[PDB]
RNA sequence: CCACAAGUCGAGCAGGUACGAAAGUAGGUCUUAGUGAUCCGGUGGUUCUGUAUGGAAGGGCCAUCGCUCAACGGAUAAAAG
RNA sequence: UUCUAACUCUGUCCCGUGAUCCGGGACGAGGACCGUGUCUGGUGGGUAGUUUGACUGGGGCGGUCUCCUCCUAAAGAGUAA
RNA sequence: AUAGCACUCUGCAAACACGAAAGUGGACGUAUAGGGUGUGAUGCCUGCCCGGUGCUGGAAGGUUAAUUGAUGGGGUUAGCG
RNA sequence: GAACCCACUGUCGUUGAAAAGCCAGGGGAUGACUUGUGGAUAGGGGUGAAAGGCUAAUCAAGCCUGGUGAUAGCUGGUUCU
RNA sequence: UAUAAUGGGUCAGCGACUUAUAUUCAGUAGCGAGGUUAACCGUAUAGGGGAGCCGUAGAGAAAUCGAGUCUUAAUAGGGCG
RNA sequence: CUCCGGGGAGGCGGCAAAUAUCCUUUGAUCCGGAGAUGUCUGAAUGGGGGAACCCACCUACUUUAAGGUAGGUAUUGCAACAUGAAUACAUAGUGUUGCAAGGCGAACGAGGGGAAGUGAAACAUCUCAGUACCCUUAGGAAAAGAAAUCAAUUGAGAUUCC
């Protein structure tokens, strides 16, 4: 499913609103994609499915911290 | 349940001691061509006619 | 991002300079390969504290 | 005059005015056609209101502007077989 | 115009493995393009919801739909096709 | 419908179709192949028109969206009064 | 030209022997043939040598149950003195 | 409408203006410039519970005034009382 | 069927009579409590399957022929232990032991999705309505809850229901 491993973002629902104010169901999707990160402490590449906000959090906190946090929630990475 | 006021009518009518008062029509625009007498005699409030009082009462139960 | 250079680069600087680079450059080329480290307080303090002399002696 | 909403005539009182020596005449044109409700907004004023208080924004009142809404009491801002 | 390090391969080899899926490893060919997310202009009977007036010597076609003057209107007012 | 004929698209991870995606058919095929459209064995043949709509190729002049935010005009108050 | 598969004409039958038949004639009958068993495609979808045909005697959008006691300016009815 | 306009073969049984809340008017009973409690408590149709509602004053868009008030330069005139 | 307690002249369930045989004052039938037994299908869990069927393996004992009894043999998640590639350390993978879960059921709760008939005397904004319905998942209740809340004489004091 389209779920980010770092933030938990997922598609949401909303409306298309026309100029005549007709309303139609739509979805908003995350900016999801796969990326490989070098885990030094284990000497290996780890593949994650995440958003660009997830990348910003990784740049802010470091990859090993995020990996430990994810393993703390029972994720197999 | 409770009776509900017709808010459009509530915005048009107000209650006096023995009836209802209202504003006069034809004073919103297109005023240059109208004579001074019509301009000044269509200004102010008048009373609601007895033929429309019953309908106003049904539409505004609490005023 | 803010990066301090563990090892010299032709134009970014030489042996421990701190400098700003675009995010993709540091994220995809420098940090995985070990030619730089991000400018956090802990990493920076570790940089000057102990490994500064060893890195300087490891000039090549 | 009239179902309503509307429409028509009006002596006379107060202020300012024009024309007449004056008594006086003048609130458009001999008259009856030349027109469009409400809603929503624009412009000029204003001793009204102003979500703690002082202001302000917005609203109200007075004057005025935008419809061949002509299927002309005008079902929508927006529609052929 | 070059480069490789993100990214792509429904290309080759090795392992999981008794496997034309998949994952990892090594190459090769591309490469900051292609592709995806949010915003945005165009196109869009492919699909969906609907609209497409009334009078009327049946309905359609034609004409008409609001206002003013005269006659019909029977010496007050009003009076239809 | 048909054998025959013609136009047109498709260079392979093909065009095209199904599906939300993963994927599947096309095809374990490769322009002498595959899809769409029209005509309809065979004989003789198949005239003129590119103004309209469509398709294909050009141009970088006019107009135009998101984004960007230069200037100008208001509100408020330190102070001057 | 028999079996087998079809359905061109006529009489009969029409509360039928039969919710599509019998009888007398008729067409194909080594092929784009007929048939058994078991599978696949599901409703704005499927399938169709194309008739809007077929999808359980039902098809210009199957059947069942729910929204549901849909709405009906229309037709009917509305009980002793 | 005897109508050749509709409905009924006959009998017996069943079959259609209701219920809850709000409001207005008319009767009737209590109290009377006053009338009345809601939820709730309560060995519970009692007794407590006065928050609230209607009446007792209008005018004005409103600020404001108040047996007056609005309009206006106006104590004039006029509208609502 | 067994034990304990109650009870004191009948009883062998009903449709469904009668017969026949019986049981019972050495305490029956019956009533209450605690045990024992409890075929096959069904989450069904050894593999399969057209539910109530087909086919197996392992161990301990037992039989003498082609068997019997008892137990075990699902998947996933977690923990421990063992083993173990490409690849040198490792890791992935593989296996054993122990623990847990799955299914069913009225309403009420919380969350993820979400109409149209109808009304507007037409209809698109709007209404119907976050209703009907689909999906996931608790508990005896759930949810909420101890102010970065209201108020405006500088006062109140968490949430929920009338």
Residues 6+ apart with CB under 8 A from B44: B24
Using the CA of A44, give the nucleotide whose C1' is nearest: I91
How far apart are alpha carbons C27 and A55 in whole angstroms? Answer: 10
Entry resolution in angstroms? 2.4
Q: Experimental technique used?
A: cryo-EM
Q: Where are the beta strands (DSSP E) in chain A?
A: 12-17, 23-28, 32-39, 44-51
CB contact at 8 A, A62 and A39:
no
Between A38, A55, A59, which is nearest C32 by CB? A38
How far apart are alpha carbons B47 and B16 in whole angstroms? Answer: 9
Give the residues across from A25 on adjacent strands: A15
How far apart are alpha carbons A54 and C24 in whole angstroms? Answer: 14
Cβ-count burial of A49 within 10 angstroms (0-12 exposed, 13-18 middle, 19+ buried)? middle
Chain A meets chain B (3+ C-beta pairs below 8 A): no
Tell me if residue C31 falls in helix, strand or coil: helix
Query: B30 beta carbon < 7 A from strand H?
Result: no
Compute and round to an integer the Cα radius of gyration of chain C: 11
How far apart are alpha carbons A46 and A38 in whole angstroms? Answer: 6
The backbone torsions φ and ψ at residue B6, rounded to the nearest 5 degrees and listed phi first, read: -80, 105
Q: Angle at CA B28, nearest 5°, toward B27 and B30?
A: 85
Tell me if residue B22 falls in helix, strand or coil: strand
Domain total of chain B: 1
Question: How, if at all, do strands B45-47 and B14-15 pair?
Answer: unpaired
Count of C-beta atoms within a 10 Å radius of residue C43? 13
Between A38, A59, A62, which is nearest C1 by CB? A59
How far apart are alpha carbons A20 and C23 in whole angstroms? Answer: 43
Tokens describing residue A26: 């739509």
How far apart are alpha carbons A4 and A11 in whole angstroms? Answer: 10
What residues does each domain of chain A span? 1-77
């Amino acid at each position: 499913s389209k779920v980010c491993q770092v933030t938990g973002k997922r598609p949401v629902v909303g409306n298309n609103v026309s100029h005549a104010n007709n309303k139609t169901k739509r979805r908003f999707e995350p900016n999801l994609h796969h990326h490989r990160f070098w885990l030094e402490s284990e000497k290996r590449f780890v593949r994650l499915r995440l958003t660009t906000k997830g990348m910003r959090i990784i740049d802010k906190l470091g990859i090993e911290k995020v990996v430990a946090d994810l393993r703390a929630q029972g994720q197999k990475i | 349940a409770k009776l509900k006021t017709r808010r459009g009518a509530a915005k048009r009518f107000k209650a006096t001691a023995n009836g209802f008062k209202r504003k006069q029509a034809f004073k919103r625009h297109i005023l240059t061509k109208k004579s001074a007498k019509r301009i000044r005699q269509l200004r102010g409030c008048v009373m609601v006619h007895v033929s429309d009082v019953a309908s106003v009462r049904r539409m505004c139960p609490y005023i | 991002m803010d990066v301090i250079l563990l090892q010299r680069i032709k134009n970014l600087g030489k042996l421990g300079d701190k400098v700003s680079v675009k995010a993709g450059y540091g994220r995809n080329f420098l940090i995985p390969q070990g030619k730089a480290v991000a400018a956090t307080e802990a990493n920076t303090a570790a940089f000057e504290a102990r490994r500064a002399e060893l890195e300087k002696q490891e000039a090549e």
